[PDB]
Amino acid sequence: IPGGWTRQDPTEARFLELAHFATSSQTEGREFYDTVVTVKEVETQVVAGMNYKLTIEISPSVCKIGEVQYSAEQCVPKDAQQKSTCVAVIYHVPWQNQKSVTSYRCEH
Ligand SMILES: [Cl-]
Q: Alpha helices, DSSP H only, in the chain?
């Protein structure tokens, strides 16, 4: 098993699922949840578990934080033309059912 990053097909559903998980989770200093517009790039790394590195475009959603629960389906972009590019790293330990956001960094 190599230690490096392996580039994936970014259009896979599981990666969109993970992108929403990471984005829905960024709630500091906002009135609204941000949401995912697009998954541009994906890289995985085998550690004691799996690292997912997602390059995504995000946009503010219609869902107000603390007013509703986040869902991909409900929380569409206010305006999907207003995009920001971020890199999210998710650490997954499948046998403990744990996902954490290692880092979430927006170029903008
Ligand atoms: Cl690394």
A: 13-23
